[PDB]
Structure formats: C-alpha cells, structure tokens
Design a protein around this ligand. Structure first.
Ligand SMILES: *[C@@H]1O[C@H](CO)[C@@H](O[C@@H]2O[C@H](CO)[C@@H](O[C@@H]3O[C@H](CO[C@H]4O[C@H](CO[C@@H]5O[C@H](CO)[C@@H](O)[C@H](O)[C@@H]5O)[C@@H](O)[C@H](O[C@H]5O[C@H](CO)[C@@H](O)[C@H](O)[C@@H]5O)[C@@H]4O)[C@@H](O)[C@H](O[C@H]4O[C@H](CO)[C@@H](O)[C@H](O)[C@@H]4O)[C@@H]3O)[C@H](O)[C@H]2NC(C)=O)[C@H](O)[C@H]1NC(C)=O
Ligand SMILES: *[C@@H]1O[C@H](CO)[C@@H](O[C@@H]2O[C@H](CO)[C@@H](O[C@@H]3O[C@H](CO[C@H]4O[C@H](CO[C@H]5O[C@H](CO)[C@@H](O)[C@H](O)[C@@H]5O)[C@@H](O)[C@H](O[C@H]5O[C@H](CO)[C@@H](O)[C@H](O)[C@@H]5O)[C@@H]4O)[C@@H](O)[C@H](O[C@H]4O[C@H](CO)[C@@H](O)[C@H](O)[C@@H]4O)[C@@H]3O)[C@H](O)[C@H]2NC(C)=O)[C@H](O)[C@H]1NC(C)=O
Lengths: 319, 320
C-alpha cells in the first residue's frame, strides 16, 4: 500500500528540425507516492541551485500524492554539458535523477545499432539473443570496447565480438549477447556500451521489450499461376499483416520439415495504412517439391499469436 | 475571456551521461484550452498515427481545461530522426507542435546524388530526366554552382533548378535535366558537377543506362480474402519478379485513374536467386472504390517488357 516516491525528468523537446528552444525547461516529476514530507532541490554539476530558479508544486488525488518541479535553463547553459540533478527528499530519504544534453547519436559519422531478440529464438528455439552492431568509422590504433550491462545490474552471460573491416574503408564490430528468456520477457533492459579510443566519450544503446498493445498477425499465402517459359518452378508469397509489435519471424515448412532460411526472403516490417505492420515472404519452389508433397506452409512467430506464439497458412500450387 | 489552447511537447531526458533511455516517451501538453471536447492526434512524419499508442488525460479543475497525451517510442525509432507531431483540434482549425531528435553538435557535410530516368518517364511519359541533388549545404555565404555535361561532349538541354531550405537549417539544391530517350537508351553518360567556395575540390557524379542482361518482369496481383475483420476495405498485393535490370516503375490503376504513389507501399528491388529482381506491392482499397469499379490493375514499367515496356494484372475483390 505504501508507494515510495519515484523521480523522473522530462525536458523541452527540439524543433521539428531538431533545434533547441531559446530556453530549456526541466520538469521533475515525483509521481504517485504515499503522501509525506517532501522537498525538491536542483543541482547543477553537484551544486545546489538558487531557489528562485525552480517552481515546485504538489497535489494529491485519493490515496497518493504527486509533485513536480520546473527548472528553466539558458540554452547556452544546457548546451555546455552541465549536469542537472533533481534531488528529492521524501520522509528524510533522498531520491535522485540526473540529465544533461543528449550526446551525439552519430559521433563522427559513426552509427550504433542494438537489436531485440527474433521471435523464433525467443519462442521456438528458446535461446534469445541481442546483437550490437557498430558501423561507419575508420581504423585507428586502440581497439573498440563493447561491454554489455543490464539496467537491473544483474549479471549478463558472456557476449561475443566479431569485427570485420569493410570495402568502403570502414570497420564493423558486432557482438551478440545471449539473454535470459524470462529475463527479457519480464521487461529487462540490456544496454550496449562502446568506448572507441578514437571517439570522444562512450556511445550507448539500450534495448528492452516493446510495451505497446499487441495484435496477432494475419497470414495469407498465395501461389503464382504458371508463367510461360518457367514450367517446373513456382513462387509462393504470403502477406503477414496487421500485427503489433513489429518484431516477427517467418519460416516455411515443406513435408513437415522446415526449410533453411536461405531458401526464402522476407521484407522488413512496414506499417499498414491503418494500425499494424505487414511483411511479405517469398519462397521459390520446385516441381519435384510439390509433386513430392503439394503443401507449403508459411509460418509466422509473433508474441501476440496464440496458443504457441505462432500463426500459419498453407498453400498448394495445384488446385 | 475565451482562452486559446496551447500545444507544448516535453520528452524523456537523457542519462546523466547523456545517454538515451531504452525507450523515449513524448508528452504533449495542450494547456489552458477552455473546457470542451477536443481531439488529440499524433503524426509520425505527417502520417497520422493510430491512437492505439496514446493516452488522453484531462483536469479542467478550477476552471479552464488542460489535457495531455503521451506517446512512447523505442530508442531505435527515436534515433532514426523521425519527426513527430501532436495535433489538437479545437474550433475548426487544428493547432500543433513538432519535435525530433536534437541535431548533433557538429553538423555533417554536403553530399551529392545523381538519380536516373525512371522507367515510367522513360517509357510511359516519354519525357525522361535525371536529377542532381546536393544536400546539407551551408547557406548564407556563397551559392552552389551545379553544371551538367555529356561524355560524348554533345550539348545538354536547359535544366531547371530548385533551392529549398530544410527545417534542419540545411539547404537542398535540385537540378533536374531533361535527357533524350534515344540518347539515354544508347548509353550516353551524364555528369553532374557541384562546386562552392565552402567546398574543397569539385564534386562529380555520373549516370548512364544500367548495363548487363535484361529480363522481362512477371506480374501477379492477389487479393486477401473477405473476412469479418476487413469488410469495407480489402488488401491487394502484387508481386513483380525476375526482371533485369533493377530499374522499374510500379503503379496501381483504377477506374482509368493512376492512383497516387502514396496510396501503395512498394518495396525496393531485391535479388531473387540470381534469376533477377523482385518487388512486392501492397494496396489497401475501399468499398467505395470497388463499388465505383471492381477492378484494380497492377502495372509495372520496365525496358525489357514487350511490346511497350509494360506488364500488368488486374484483380477484383468481388465475384464479378
Ligand atoms: C535535413 O533535412 C533533409 C531533408 O529535408 C535531409 O536531406 C536528405 O539527405 C539525404 C542524404 O543526406 C538524402 O538521401 C538520398 O536521397 C536520394 C534521393 O532520393 C529520392 O530520389 C531517388 C532518385 O529518383 C528516382 O529515380 C528513380 C530511377 O532511378 C525513379 O524510378 C523515381 O521516380 C525517381 O525519379 C529515389 O530513388 C527516392 O525514392 C524514394 O522515395 C519514394 C517516395 O515515394 C519511394 O517510393 C521510394 O521507394 C524511395 O524510398 C527518392 O525519391 C537517394 O537517391 C539517395 O540514395 C542513396 O543513399 C541511400 C541512403 O538512405 C541508400 O539507401 C541508397 O542506396 C543510395 O546509396 C539517398 O537516399 C535525402 O534525399 C535528403 N532529403 C531531401 C533533400 O529532401 C538532410 O540530411 C537533413 N540534415 C540533417 C542530416 O540533419
Ligand atoms: C560501408 O559498408 C558497410 C558494410 O557493412 C555498411 O554497413 C552497413 O551500414 C548500414 C547503415 O548505414 C547498416 O544498416 C542498419 O542495420 C541495422 C541492423 O540490421 C542488421 O540486423 C538486423 C537484425 O538482425 C540482427 O539482430 C538480431 C538480434 O540479435 C540477430 O538475431 C541477427 O542475427 C542479426 O544480428 C537484420 O534484419 C539486418 O538485415 C537486413 O538485411 C537482410 C538481407 O537479407 C534483410 O533480410 C533484413 O530484413 C534487413 O534489411 C541487418 O543484419 C538496422 O537496425 C538499421 O536500421 C536503420 O536503417 C534502416 C534502413 O533500411 C531503416 O529502415 C531503419 O528505420 C533504421 O533507420 C540499418 O538498416 C548495415 O547493417 C551495415 N552492414 C552490416 C555490417 O550489417 C556501411 O553503411 C558502408 N558505409 C558507407 C560508405 O556508407
């Protein structure tokens, strides 16, 4: 029934063109907590700021109370990389949160990408995985460090790096940390921190399960009519659509045996003209295969599908 | 008196280290708006986003109303620099506010791209042009000199130029040049050359008819079945494959109208299995549309298609 105070900071957003506002407001929120003596103080690089600079108010609703504090900063100050801490003292105890201008996302043309677990792995193979790919940089001296960490601080299995210099003259490091199935589904957060000796500071990407509403995919499989010239081959295509989140896995099975991934392609999830995503899968098939057993199954693994997180539709070439 | 609403968008703050949260929450605050119904709407790049990913809250306590709507995004999504908008509707005209990832400290440099005649312009309109686009230009001081030329040395037509200031303060200069069909078709190579005092050495991009083998595209138009979940709209799909080279234009024709590009979602050419390239197109049609004329044709334009660089298939949502 007791609800400790929780601290979080919101900030003025950027221009529709990513431009900073003349002034930056930092709104500190201490939402839904068991009413009690509370105080909110702001720190700029570890020091207490003038009371005249932040306006604080608290209100209650029912069994819990909520309070907020707004601080205005000169754009010049916000851009100087000074750190600002919202310090809350609830019932004599201290709760804190900090922020500073967001660092460059693409330092020196460089890019970083951390991805979530594919649905097949998470549900079918039951061996979840997250891959951290860092690209768009040039070879220097010192090596590149990719460490994995969990928000919960809880340990993390042993990852695996594997860079591979590219043609355009850049390097591409890629590590793949394995995650705890349960761990991931519970909403854990896995961050991928990378310190490049050539690059200024540390670049960091964080990943966790989607939160939005779920919606199972609709699966429709079609077989191309015979096309003049190519009589022993046929193409299968299935549209899997109107599903959420966008994360999905597509597999094809023939003769109760699932075929190898290289046997077909699948587009990237793209939104529908309404709610949800759609994907197209294509399987080039052969006469030997359909005269074998004339049924091919387009299977989709999505977290919203039930009972076993999968939905499928079979198709046959002949009528 | 009657107090006019005001939209403001706050966002998740970064780490104490300047790192982003595993997910970014955007909070839209339309405050002061005098009590009364109101419709908040989010837009991801102009596209209206289904309200299945939002939440309206309101407390017109004391007097004037104040409602807020929050939208959440994954780090990736946010990092893709997609621009988000929050639309309020009150007394007719809608009010709004937009936001995007803040521009990194050091802004990039100029990059030039040279497109190629689209199969459509080349074979349907028979009026092909190649475009030269210079992006991320530092305006104010100086101006970019973009000049065309042919490898044959022959004369080039007059091109038209366009200069557009982007919301991120960068500049875009678009020179688009009419080219001869016979000339393009026969291998003429065109070069675009960019210059500017705030530019080290001159830039140069060239373009010429794609080389290699040719293969005519195959076209298949399908229709998803009618079911209780989609009864006043239907999803059409089309698969165009095994064509070479990659260049191809895809449209959906209906009732003698060439639907807007925006109407459909068409993928970019991927290698089949060496057999050539393939593309997938998906179009959502409405009852009104098929009741006007129950026939939608998927057309692909490709140089290798006989006899008029065109191949097409029609599909119907209803038993004729
Ligand atoms: C400030 O804000 C600026 C925007 O407001 C932003 O500028 C953007 O910069 C980037 C790079 O810096 C630019 O990206 C490049 O865009 C090129 C042009 O794309 C468009 O034209 C293409 C060519 O024209 C077609 O030609 C074919 C035949 O060849 C015809 O069939 C067709 O009809 C056209 O004539 C075209 O292919 C593109 O099509 C896309 O859009 C249509 C829309 O419906 C869609 O249907 C298609 O499926 C497709 O998505 C465009 O119309 C492009 O050629 C470049 O491609 C290179 O780079 C990309 C990287 O994404 C890579 O994938 C490619 O393989 C290739 O190497 C590239 O995408 C962008 O155009 C600029 N936007 C502008 C000027 O409006 C600034 O960057 C920003 N500043 C910052 C960083 O803060
Ligand atoms: C110089 O050359 C290098 C050569 O590598 C080149 O590097 C590429 O750089 C681009 C960016 O410019 C990279 O593209 C980005 O890739 C991001 C991640 O994509 C990869 O991972 C996807 C997920 O699978 C991974 O993770 C799971 C989970 O752990 C794991 O199970 C998997 O094993 C795997 O590790 C994967 O889907 C994706 O594969 C693509 O291609 C296949 C082709 O078969 C296709 O089927 C897939 O659907 C997919 O398209 C890939 O392996 C990605 O998140 C990121 O997203 C942004 O860009 C896209 C553009 O399409 C936007 O749509 C989106 O909104 C985001 O903004 C982006 O796609 C690319 O991956 C690098 N290449 C490498 C090494 O993979 C440099 O660009 C060159 N430099 C110069 C000169 O410019």
């Amino acid at each position: 029934d007791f609800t400790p105070p929780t601290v979080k900071i919101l900030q003025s957003s950027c221009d529709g063109g990513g431009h900073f506002p003349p002034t930056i407001q930092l709104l500190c929120l201490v939402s839904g907590y068991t009413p009690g003596t509370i105080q909110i103080t702001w720190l700029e690089d570890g020091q207490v700021m003038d009371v005249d600079l932040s306006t604080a108010s608290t209100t209650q609703e029912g069994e819990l109370a909520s309070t907020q504090s707004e601080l205005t900063l000169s754009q010049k100050h916000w851009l100087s990389d000074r750190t600002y801490t919202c310090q809350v003292t609830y019932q004599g105890h201290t709760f804190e949160d900090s922020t500073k201008k967001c660092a460059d996302s693409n330092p020196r043309g460089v890019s970083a990408y951390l991805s979530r677990p594919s649905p097949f792995d998470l549900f079918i193979r039951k061996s979840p995985t997250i891959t951290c790919l860092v690209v768009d940089l040039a070879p220097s001296k010192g090596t590149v460090q990719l460490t994995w960490s969990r928000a919960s601080g809880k340990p993390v299995n042993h990852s695996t790096r594997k860079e591979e210099k590219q043609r355009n003259g850049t390097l591409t490091v890629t590590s793949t940390l394995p995650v705890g199935t349960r761990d991931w589904i519970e909403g854990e957060t896995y961050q991928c921190r990378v310190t490049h000796p050539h690059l200024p500071r540390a670049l960091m990407r964080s990943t966790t399960k989607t939160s939005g509403p779920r919606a199972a995919p609709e699966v429709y499989a079609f077989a191309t009519p015979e096309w003049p010239g190519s009589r022993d081959k046929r193409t299968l295509a299935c549209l899997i659509q109107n599903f959420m989140p966008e994360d999905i896995s597509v597999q094809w099975l023939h003769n109760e045996v699932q075929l190898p991934d290289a046997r077909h392609s699948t587009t990237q999830p793209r939104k529908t003209k309404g709610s949800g995503f759609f994907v197209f899968s294509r399987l080039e098939v052969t006469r030997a295969e359909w005269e074998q057993k004339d049924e091919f199954i387009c299977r989709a693994v999505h977290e919203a599908a039930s009972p076993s997180q999968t939905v499928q539709r079979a198709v046959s070439v002949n009528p």
